[PDB]
Amino acid sequence: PRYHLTRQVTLTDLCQPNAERAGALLLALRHPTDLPHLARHRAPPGRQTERLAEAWGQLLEASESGCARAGLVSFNFLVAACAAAYDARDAAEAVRAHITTNYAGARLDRFSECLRAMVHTHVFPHEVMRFFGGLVSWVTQDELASVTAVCSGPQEATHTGHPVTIPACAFVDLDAELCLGGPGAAFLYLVFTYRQCRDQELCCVYVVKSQLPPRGLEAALERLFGRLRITTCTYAAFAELGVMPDDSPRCLHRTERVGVPVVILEGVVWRPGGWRACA
């Protein structure tokens, strides 16, 4: 009812929202203790399915689940772990200087191996680490966590807009699509662009910028790419991060919390959307 609260109790083995900002684009970790099984399934047999059986098992080594399940993944944890992967180096790598000095690359180094191992056996990182929200409160303990980081529509950026102002956490991120500029409202999405066996199972996390519908986004997902050179398949999944109902309030900064480039985005209808991955 244009104001909501959500809560999930996890560890600070992940994000450590005390080390994060007030505004962070948190993911969950849905199906957290999953993927020894789907490592074996869903892949053609030339992928040697005994890789992710150890790969996530080295992740929680860096992080026993207990009663506080592994979850609440930060926005930082994918950018810096793919910083060595995608086509931005020493600028996306400034996100690694943000994490390891505030959060830890010990958990990144196990997970950057997962980002070459999850995508290896066709266990693609979309529909795992589902969207949760914008880190409203951080009522966490010392080594444990209790975060309210509301999902559920536009109210996350009104109740942090009548007061976290939604950073993009990298100037390389918030992909400035539509340089063909005009007035309107912004429509935000979460795309994982892949490269399968060309760049050896590439991982990518960035947000697009468009005044485009979901039907005007799929052909926009076929155009503007140079990573078509694959053949397996089902690359470039995306869901709706929702509407920023203003293109006027975007910004360009390098000040956060290590000087990391960052984009202020004030006022967002967080339509949670749905994923799609077929081609």
Partner: protein, 307 residues
Amino acid sequence: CFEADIAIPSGISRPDAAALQRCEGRVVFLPTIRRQLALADVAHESFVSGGVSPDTLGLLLAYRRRFPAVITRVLPTRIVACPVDLGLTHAGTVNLRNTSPVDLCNGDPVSLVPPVFEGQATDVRLESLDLTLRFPVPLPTPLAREIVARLVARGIRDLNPRTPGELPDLNVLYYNGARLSLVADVQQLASVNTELRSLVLNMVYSITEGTTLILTLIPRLLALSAQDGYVNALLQMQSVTREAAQAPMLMQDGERRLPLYEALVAWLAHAGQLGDILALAPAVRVCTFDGAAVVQSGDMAPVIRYP
């Protein structure tokens, strides 16, 4: 609603102000999200591209990259439109006008189709503001998916001639009775070609490795034909399935991948999505509060969200 207005820009033909009154509940394709916008991008002259007007398959592609909007209230100064793509958050269920020869149902998903009918052109003309208006025809979605397959395949017959001139017209439609004839006047090629390619390229990926085992059971299909009712009615007479009847190819690597289960996945990925990648997305659903089971031609039906 997240209110969006379109003003009356310049002058009025005095009966044509009443023509804007009887368009309450229709749909405007405005290619933006504005707090105010001129009426110039509204009409079909904006639908016309550089030099050339779209065909009824190009208008599908023209209605692709624009935004539908519902006429809510009609002022002599403005027209308040509600942005369907975002502002469908209406427990008041903002109302639409059915301009269609089909009496629908209760509970139909409703998708929008350009005017292609033989007698429901929806042509209203403004001469003070020199503009032409084609309103889309809201229709039920299986009947909508029965139309778009006809018009592309009619343009598939625009590539190759070969056959004698007596072709099956693709111009007789069937809803419980109700013989419908549509318009076949012009078929622009690029609207056919780009629609044909995605019909090709999606049907490429919808075949996989474990898909091939299913092809063995094609003679198994006709074994059910002469021994039941359901199968024999399922098997169409104008089908290639009755024509193709007149094998593992071992290559077995590993055999723990579930090859038959993986076949139905990627087939559904692309051949399962063939109505919506060719046509417009349905977001309008029939929902009347009074318990009325159908909605008459010309009525004001209440409209709820995405199906």
